[PDB]
């Protein structure tokens, strides 16, 4: 959509002030990048959703797609966080509030069988950390299929060398160009025939 | 293209009331043989208080069916610099105006059930006690009034019946095909397996973007060609203009 | 259990099997309609001599079973030993099998005369379309060239009912009008095959040298099995049987 | 031996059927629904085949008391069933996400709102 | 599997399977100019199949409606006795169950020839669908990526250089 | 696509040649089979001839259906009427109308009957329609409308 | 260069016929080696044969079992790949004829 | 100008508010529709607060209702600001119906004043 004298390839620059050694460099030389298909690899690669969401913002800041991703994972990361927050905070009121009258949930042993931690321990710490560790599997389920598409596209655009701002970007007020609003019709003149 | 399709997914919703009151007067009439006019009043000033639910949208609905045929608008007047009240006649589509009479005799009937109510239940307080007769005739006239509710769906009719008086002689050479039975046991087979794949097999995901506001307004681009209608040239300048306030 | 019920009920497992089988199954191979109906009537030939053999063997075994155990007057063999009866009734069957097969496989050459062609006195039609197809059987030991292609594809439309009115328009087709013409005429008004063209010709020399190195002879036209296959014997010029005919071949 | 399994009927397609005894063997010792139509299709399939008078009429009696019984478990069905159906309905309606994203074409009469025919609509008079 | 395959109307369990309610979506947002005159016949003779199944849907669903409603009321069958609460109560059951139905996704063969073709035809209809019709197409595209489908409108393109313009959702790589 | 060639005018001799060849269409025409003289005679003719094949399998097949089907499902599906669902043996349970059933398994037979005989009918069409092959009258693009000349053929 | 073009309906409708016929295949496979193993404890347990009768055995219940699960599959592709090859075949015979 | 079909994504909070804002003070809309959402602001306003004030008023009076009176202040509180809470939802959400479908009215009106819908002409 953007014209190409009208582009600033911000992208490039950016590719440009990055260092020496860098991944997206070598991507640009024509490394090319291949989803993990095993278990362990995609295990590992769902730590990376982070790290590739952010250097996708920084190479394609104020892309639709990009800038849409963010803010529904920034906004999905507060929705969850909370609510499992809100989960811990009932559990740990309702567990307290029936210990205190002598109600004990029958879960997890009595006694732990190492350092013999004892059962009403562990089950507010179960439920501080399981909550915890759902949200961040859930979350990254989500969006690991999601971030990969986009990381390879980005990776298929450095191996073209097309570092030109791709489509759907819009930039700020600054850099976008003023519309001449002056126009002035031809004469009017009477046609020979 | 008008078509005048309304949504069933509405529909439903709003003749929650009515069937609820038919089958709440059921209950009453079955019970009672072996209940007394005390413990049944519960009953009574449900359907009482429902029937005076289903009125209230009645009218609602009725007020403004008949409010349509007076156009009122602001006129501003610039010499004067003064904004002015002016009143005007309607002009629309036939089909509307006799649906509007319709739905104008539909009121009508059920006042005239709700009178029958009204004048039902003082009759059953002063006498102390219920009876088949008067009763049973309440029942079937919410029954009678919930059928006439459905006028105003006469359109889905249309839609599906009109196809039917469309298709040529068979013999006048046209087509040459029928498929009626044919495909009346063809789908019975699809939708056997349209269900079994719906509940055991791939289903896509319905999961998409909630947040990033006018994100599902697609400019017209490379990607999704430029064949959309044409004067969608001011959409696009308006998606653009919107893009750039969010950023 | 729905669709092993349809197995078990269709009505086509009643209906009686036809002859239609090998020729589509001749058509899924590759071979035209008429090539598959010669092919296939080749096919039916021989095997029906080993077919009616199988028959006539075991026909003859059920009616005269009773002859090897006769023979044990001459044979003890085959009362002491049931084995040595049973390879004496398989032999039986294998010998119907062969002399079936004699009558319909063997050459058992015969006369060309409208008198007597076809009453399976000799094996002529069998011989001759047998020995037709062997000797001007090739196969193309070539790769179809780009303007064969390209002429194969350009063949979607043609169509001998009516023939097609060409135009010459300049900017698409270049050249001169007459050339131009003279060209379409020999692609397809003449009937002229892509691969007798001259410079197509030379085309598949160029491209298969290595093989006219090492000898061996490039077949320009591809096997035409229609050419040299026909159940009539029309193709072959034998004379049909005068009773089930009424015209004559000069011969 | 085709005619063996065509034209040959088993005995029950031809024979009065008999009591399912199992039905009968242990029944719950609640006065449900269950028991009572039990009891009801006993007195009525006798009623139709038996020629005993005196002990038809008494069944008739007490069949009657059956099938006022019946009826007052049935408005209890009806009655739980037929709430639990509006209850769930309007919850369904309470929190589904009802589509408000339809065409609005069919609203929209642009030849309409705005006569196109302006004052040739009157008289005419050209 | 049925005798008469060779049908248009007819389906197969791995045709592209698009409901009622999608079908006729789709056909607000195309244009009967930009389509070629095959095209247009595919169509023509899709409709003509959909005129008589969409009428015949709620007949399909009026036995399990019908059974539904029975149970509702009671476990009492009562013949005429009982068809005014049936079918007072049976007329918003069975749109219940129609909408089940219409929702459900079915094959059929002119479905996959006009969304798969790979021709004009096929990438117009595509793009329209994308673009008019994100949240159909949305849908769309995940069925045809799991069916082995590839074209550059589909969301779950590897090898595209432009970012995607819907969520795209999980799935096997 | 491409034009064909068109002829000349025909002469006189060709004139009576198609003259003699509708002619010898016209006598072909059987006499109990009621089509309009028209564009579309012979194009109609070979419909009516194809749908004719078409109707006689349809209803070999359906035939064999009412014949397969019967002793597979509905004699079968009659043996749900030897009881209700309470064990007690089928009774009569008349609607409004007392009718005296006093001949043995009158009540089951006939209600049995009312069911099984819909079902019967409704199986075999379902069966018919099934196995029973509409692709020689069937014409996804509709080219089967040219109008065939009778001089043509 | 241009080459043969097949069509694209029946490239698609093989494409379904394939796409199933392959799941099938796998799981029928499953199904077959299930059926062995089960027919296998059988014979082995009621049955009183010689151990070779009773593989033999087991190993044409399982192949049964198996092709009932995949008839169906293997039968609409086997047809519909035949209704492609004899098309093709026709075309491509149209085309080269001389 | 936005899709339509039960799969798409019903008006967003943030959607609303822009469109609101570009009727009321663009230039390419026309005196008449601007009249109509600025008209739709005022007389929506009012039930904003008049279901707020009803619901204190009843709440105050629950509060002190014959059973609520005797309750605990657990109970007591609790019962008590249910009326408000109903009422103050209650003029909240007919306010946001009211402005929003005339705002949709006039964004109607805009539509096929610069004809944006591809089913509606003259
Ligand atoms: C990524 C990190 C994320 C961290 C999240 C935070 C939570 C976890 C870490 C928290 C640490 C701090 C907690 C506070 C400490 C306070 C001190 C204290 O008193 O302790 C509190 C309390 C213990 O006190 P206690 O009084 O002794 O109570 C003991 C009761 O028995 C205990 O009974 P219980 O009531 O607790 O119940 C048993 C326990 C369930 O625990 C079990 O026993 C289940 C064991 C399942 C084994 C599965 C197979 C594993 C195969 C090999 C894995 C290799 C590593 C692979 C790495 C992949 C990449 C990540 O809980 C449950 O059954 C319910 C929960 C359901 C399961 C969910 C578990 C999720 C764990 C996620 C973190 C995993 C970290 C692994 C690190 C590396 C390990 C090599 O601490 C805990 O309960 C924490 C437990 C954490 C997991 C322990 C795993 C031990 C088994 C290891 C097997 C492999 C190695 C064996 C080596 C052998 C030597 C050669
Ligand atoms: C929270 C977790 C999430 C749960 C989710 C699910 C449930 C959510 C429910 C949300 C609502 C909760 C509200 C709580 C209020 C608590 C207020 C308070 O201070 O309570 C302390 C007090 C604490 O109890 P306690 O001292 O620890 O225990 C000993 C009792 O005090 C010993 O005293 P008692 O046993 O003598 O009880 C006093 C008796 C005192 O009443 C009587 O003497 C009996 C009066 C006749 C009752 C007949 C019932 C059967 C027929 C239906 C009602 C007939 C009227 C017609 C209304 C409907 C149709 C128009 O009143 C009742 O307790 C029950 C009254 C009847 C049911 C409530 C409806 C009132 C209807 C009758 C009033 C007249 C209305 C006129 C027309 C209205 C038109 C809009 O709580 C109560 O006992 C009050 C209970 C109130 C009912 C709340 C439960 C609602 C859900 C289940 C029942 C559904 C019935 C629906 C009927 C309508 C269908 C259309
Ligand atoms: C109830 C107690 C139980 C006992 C009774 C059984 C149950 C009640 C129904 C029985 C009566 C059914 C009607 C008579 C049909 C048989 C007539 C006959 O033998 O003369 C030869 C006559 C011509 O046969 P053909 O030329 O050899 O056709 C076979 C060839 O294969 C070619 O086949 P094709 O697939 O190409 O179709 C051929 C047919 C195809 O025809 C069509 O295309 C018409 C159908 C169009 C589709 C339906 C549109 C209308 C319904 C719309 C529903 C909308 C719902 C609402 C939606 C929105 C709101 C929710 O077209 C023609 O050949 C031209 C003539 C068309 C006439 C159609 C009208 C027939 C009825 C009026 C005359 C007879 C009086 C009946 C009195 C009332 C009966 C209830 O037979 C037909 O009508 C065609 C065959 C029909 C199937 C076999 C029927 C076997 C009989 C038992 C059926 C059991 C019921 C289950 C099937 C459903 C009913 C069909
Ligand atoms: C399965 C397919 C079915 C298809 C569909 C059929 C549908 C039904 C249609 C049926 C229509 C009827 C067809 C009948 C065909 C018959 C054959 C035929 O057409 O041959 C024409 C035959 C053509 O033979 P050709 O000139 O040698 O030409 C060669 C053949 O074209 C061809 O020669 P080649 O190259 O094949 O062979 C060369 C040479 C190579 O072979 C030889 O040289 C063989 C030499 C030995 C003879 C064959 C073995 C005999 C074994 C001993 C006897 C049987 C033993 C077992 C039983 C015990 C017997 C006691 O063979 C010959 O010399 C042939 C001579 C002809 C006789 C031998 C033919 C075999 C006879 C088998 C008889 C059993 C089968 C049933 C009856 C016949 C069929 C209906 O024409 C004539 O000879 C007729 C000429 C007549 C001229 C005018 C005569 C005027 C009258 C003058 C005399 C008046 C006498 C008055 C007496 C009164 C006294 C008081
Ligand atoms: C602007 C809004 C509308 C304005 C118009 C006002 C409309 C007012 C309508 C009032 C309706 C009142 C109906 C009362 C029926 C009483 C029936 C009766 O006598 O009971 C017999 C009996 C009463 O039985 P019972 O149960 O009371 O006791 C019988 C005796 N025991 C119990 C001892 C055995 O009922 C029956 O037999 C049952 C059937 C009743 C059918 C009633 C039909 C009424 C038809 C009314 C037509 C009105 C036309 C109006 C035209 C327009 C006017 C503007
Ligand atoms: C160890 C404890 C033992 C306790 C005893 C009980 C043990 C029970 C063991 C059950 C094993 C089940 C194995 C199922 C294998 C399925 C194989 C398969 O794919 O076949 C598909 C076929 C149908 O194939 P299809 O082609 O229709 O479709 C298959 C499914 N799709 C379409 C997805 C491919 O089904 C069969 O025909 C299976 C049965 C074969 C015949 C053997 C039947 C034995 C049982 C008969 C009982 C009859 C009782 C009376 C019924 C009266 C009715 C009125
Ligand atoms: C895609 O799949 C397909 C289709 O689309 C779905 C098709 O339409 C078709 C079209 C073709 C068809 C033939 C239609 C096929 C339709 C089918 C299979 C569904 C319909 C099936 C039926 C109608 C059969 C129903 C019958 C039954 C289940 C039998 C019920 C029997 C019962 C209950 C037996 C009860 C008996 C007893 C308990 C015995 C009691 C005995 C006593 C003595 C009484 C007791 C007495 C004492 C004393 C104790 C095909 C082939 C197909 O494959
Ligand atoms: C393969 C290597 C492994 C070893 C096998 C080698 C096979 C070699 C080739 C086949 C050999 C066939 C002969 C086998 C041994 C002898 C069989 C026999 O007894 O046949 C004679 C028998 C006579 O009938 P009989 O029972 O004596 O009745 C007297 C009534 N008073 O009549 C019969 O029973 C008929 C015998 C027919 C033999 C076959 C003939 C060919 C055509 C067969 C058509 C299909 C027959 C299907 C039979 C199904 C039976 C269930």
Redesign the pocket.
């Given at each position: 959509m953007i014209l190409p004298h009208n582009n600033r390839q911000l992208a490039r620059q950016y590719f440009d002030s990055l260092p020496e050694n860098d991944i997206n460099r070598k991507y640009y030389e024509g490394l090319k990048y291949e989803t993990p298909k095993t278990f362990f690899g995609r295990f590992l690669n769902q730590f990376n959703i982070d790290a590739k969401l952010d250097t996708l913002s920084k190479f394609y800041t104020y892309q639709k797609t990009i800038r849409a991703t963010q803010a529904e994972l920034q906004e999905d990361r507060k929705s969850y966080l909370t609510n499992s927050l809100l989960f811990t905070a009932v559990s740990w009121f309702s567990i307290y509030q029936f210990a205190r009258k002598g109600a004990v949930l029958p879960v997890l042993r009595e006694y732990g069988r190492y350092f013999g931690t004892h059962r009403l321990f562990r089950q507010y710490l179960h439920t501080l950390v399981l909550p915890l560790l759902y949200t961040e599997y859930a979350l990254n389920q989500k969006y690991y299929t999601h971030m990969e598409h986009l990381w390879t596209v980005h990776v298929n655009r450095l191996n073209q060398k097309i570092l030109e701002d791709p489509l759907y970007t819009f930039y700020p007020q600054e850099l976008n160009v003023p519309k001449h609003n002056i126009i002035v019709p031809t004469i009017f003149r009477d046609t020979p025939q | 293209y008008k078509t005048h399709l309304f949504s069933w997914r509405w529909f439903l919703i709003k003749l929650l009331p009515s069937v609820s009151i038919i089958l709440l007067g059921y209950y009453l009439q079955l019970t009672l043989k072996w209940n007394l006019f005390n413990k049944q009043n519960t009953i009574v000033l449900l359907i009482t208080l429902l029937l005076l639910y289903i009125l209230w949208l009645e009218f609602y609905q009725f007020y403004h069916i008949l409010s349509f045929y007076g156009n009122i608008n602001w006129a501003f007047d610039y010499d004067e610099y003064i904004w002015t009240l002016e009143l005007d006649t309607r002009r629309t589509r036939l089909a509307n105006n006799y649906i509007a009479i319709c739905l104008f005799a539909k009121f009508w009937h059920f006042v005239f059930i709700f009178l029958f109510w009204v004048f039902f239940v003082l009759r059953i307080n002063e006498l102390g006690r219920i009876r088949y007769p008067l009763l049973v005739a309440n029942v079937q006239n919410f029954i009678i009034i919930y059928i006439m509710s459905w006028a105003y769906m006469y359109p889905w009719?249309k839609f599906?019946?009109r196809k039917?008086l469309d298709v040529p002689y068979?013999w006048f050479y046209l087509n040459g095909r029928?498929?009626?039975?044919?495909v009346?046991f063809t789908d019975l087979k699809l939708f056997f397996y349209g269900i079994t794949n719906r509940l055991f097999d791939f289903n896509p995901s319905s999961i998409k973007f909630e947040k990033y506001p006018f994100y599902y307004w697609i400019n017209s681009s490379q990607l999704t060609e430029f064949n959309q209608y044409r004067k969608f040239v001011i959409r696009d300048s308006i998606i653009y203009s919107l893009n750039n306030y969010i950023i | 259990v729905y669709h092993l019920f349809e197995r078990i009920c269709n009505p086509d497992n009643f209906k009686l099997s036809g002859e239609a089988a090998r020729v589509r199954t001749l058509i899924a191979a590759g071979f035209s309609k008429e090539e598959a109906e010669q092919v296939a009537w080749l096919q039916n030939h021989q095997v029906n001599g080993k077919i009616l053999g199988l028959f006539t063997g075991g026909f003859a075994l059920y009616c005269c079973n009773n002859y090897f155990h006769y023979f044990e007057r001459y044979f003890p063999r085959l009362r002491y030993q049931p084995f040595t009866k049973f390879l004496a009734q398989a032999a039986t069957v294998y010998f119907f099998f062969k002399i079936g097969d004699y009558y319909f496989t063997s050459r058992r050459y015969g006369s060309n005369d409208a008198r007597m062609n076809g009453l399976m006195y000799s094996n002529t039609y069998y011989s001759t379309n047998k020995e037709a197809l062997i000797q001007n059987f090739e196969p193309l030991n070539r790769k179809f060239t780009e303007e064969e292609v390209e002429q194969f594809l350009r063949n979607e439309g043609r169509s001998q009912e009516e023939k097609r009115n060409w135009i010459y328009n300049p900017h698409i087709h270049g050249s001169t009008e007459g050339e131009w013409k003279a060209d379409i005429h020999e692609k397809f008004d003449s009937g002229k095959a892509p691969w007798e063209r001259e410079h197509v010709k030379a085309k598949i020399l160029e491209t298969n040298k290595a093989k006219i190195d090492a000898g061996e002879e490039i077949q320009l036209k591809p096997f035409k099995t229609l050419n040299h296959l026909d159940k009539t014997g029309l193709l072959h010029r034998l004379h049909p049987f005068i009773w089930t005919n009424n015209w004559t071949l000069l011969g | 031996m085709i005619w063996k399994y065509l034209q040959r009927t088993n005995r029950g397609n031809i024979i009065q059927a008999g009591l399912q005894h199992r039905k009968f063997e242990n029944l719950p010792f609640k006065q449900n629904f269950d028991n009572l139509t039990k009891a009801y299709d006993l007195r009525m399939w006798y009623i139709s085949n038996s020629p005993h008078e005196a002990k038809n009429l008494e069944y008739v009696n007490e069949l009657e008391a059956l099938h006022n019984e019946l009826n007052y478990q049935n408005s209890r069905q009806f009655l739980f069933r037929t709430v639990s159906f509006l209850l769930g309905w309007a919850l369904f309606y309470q929190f589904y996400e009802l589509p408000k994203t339809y065409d609005w074409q069919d609203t929209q009469e642009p030849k309409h709102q705005v006569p196109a025919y302006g004052d040739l609509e009157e008289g005419g008079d050209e | 599997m049925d005798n008469n395959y060779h049908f248009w109307g007819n389906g197969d369990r791995q045709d592209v399977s698009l409901s009622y309610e999608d079908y006729y979506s789709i056909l607000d947002c195309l244009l009967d100019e930009k389509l070629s005159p095959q095209g247009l016949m595919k169509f023509k003779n899709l409709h003509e199949v959909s005129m008589?199944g969409v009428?015949?849907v709620?007949?399909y669903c009026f036995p399990v409606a019908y059974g539904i409603s029975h149970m509702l009321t009671g476990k009492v069958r009562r013949g005429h006795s009982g068809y005014r609460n049936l079918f007072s109560l049976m007329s918003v059951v069975l749109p219940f169950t129609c909408w089940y139905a219409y929702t459900t996704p079915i094959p059929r063969r002119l479905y996959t020839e006009i969304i798969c073709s790979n021709n004009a035809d096929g990438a117009y209809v595509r793009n329209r669908i994308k673009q008019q019709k994100p949240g159909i197409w949305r849908k769309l595209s995940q069925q045809l990526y799991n069916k082995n489908f590839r074209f550059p409108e589909l969301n779950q393109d590897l090898t595209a250089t432009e970012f995607p313009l819907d969520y795209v959702a999980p799935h096997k790589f | 696509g491409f034009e064909t060639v068109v002829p000349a005018p025909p002469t006189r001799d060709d004139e009576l040649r198609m003259i003699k060849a509708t002619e010898e269409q016209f006598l072909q025409q059987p006499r109990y089979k009621l089509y309009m003289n028209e564009a579309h005679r012979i194009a109609k003719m070979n419909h009516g001839d194809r749908?004719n094949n078409?109707?006689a399998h349809?209803?070999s097949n359906?035939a064999l259906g009412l014949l397969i089907t019967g002793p597979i499902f509905i004699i079968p599906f009659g043996k749900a009427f030897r009881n209700l669902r309470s064990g007690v043996p089928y009774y009569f349970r008349p609607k409004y109308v007392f009718t005296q059933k006093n001949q043995y398994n009158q009540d089951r037979n006939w209600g049995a009957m009312k069911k099984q005989?819909?079902l019967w009918?409704?199986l075999?069409?379902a069966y018919?329609?099934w196995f029973?092959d509409?692709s020689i009258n069937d014409d996804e693009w509709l080219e089967k409308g040219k109008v065939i000349y009778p001089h043509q053929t | 260069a241009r080459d043969f073009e097949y069509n694209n309906q029946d490239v698609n409708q093989l494409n379904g016929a394939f796409i199933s016929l392959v799941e099938d295949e796998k799981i029928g496979f499953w199904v077959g080696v299930g059926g062995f193993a089960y027919s296998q404890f059988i014979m082995r347990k009621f049955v009183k044969s010689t151990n070779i009768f009773a593989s033999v055995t087991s190993l044409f219940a399982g192949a049964a079992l198996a092709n009932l699960y995949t008839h169906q599959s293997r039968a609409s592709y086997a047809r519909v790949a035949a209704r492609a090859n004899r098309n093709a075949s026709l075309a491509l015979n149209k085309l080269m004829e001389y | 100008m936005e899709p339509f079909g039960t799969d798409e994504r019903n008006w967003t909070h943030e959607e609303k508010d822009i469109i609101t804002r570009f009727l009321k003070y663009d230039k390419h809309v026309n005196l008449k529709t601007a009249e109509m959402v600025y008209s739709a602001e005022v007389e929506s306003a009012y039930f904003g607060k008049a279901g707020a004030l009803a619901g204190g008023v009843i709440s105050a009076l629950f509060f002190n209702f014959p059973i609520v009176r005797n309750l605990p202040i657990i109970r007591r509180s609790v019962i008590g600001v249910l009326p408000f809470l109903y009422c103050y939802t209650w003029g909240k959400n007919t306010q946001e119906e009211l402005r929003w479908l005339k705002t949709f009215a006039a964004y109607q009106r805009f539509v096929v004043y610069h004809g944006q819908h591809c089913k509606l002409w003259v």
């Open positions: - | 009719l599906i019946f039917y068979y029928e498929l009626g039975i044919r009346f | - | - | 008589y009428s015949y709620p007949l | 749908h078409i109707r349809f209803w359906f005989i819909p009918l409704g075999s069409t018919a329609y029973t509409f | - | -």
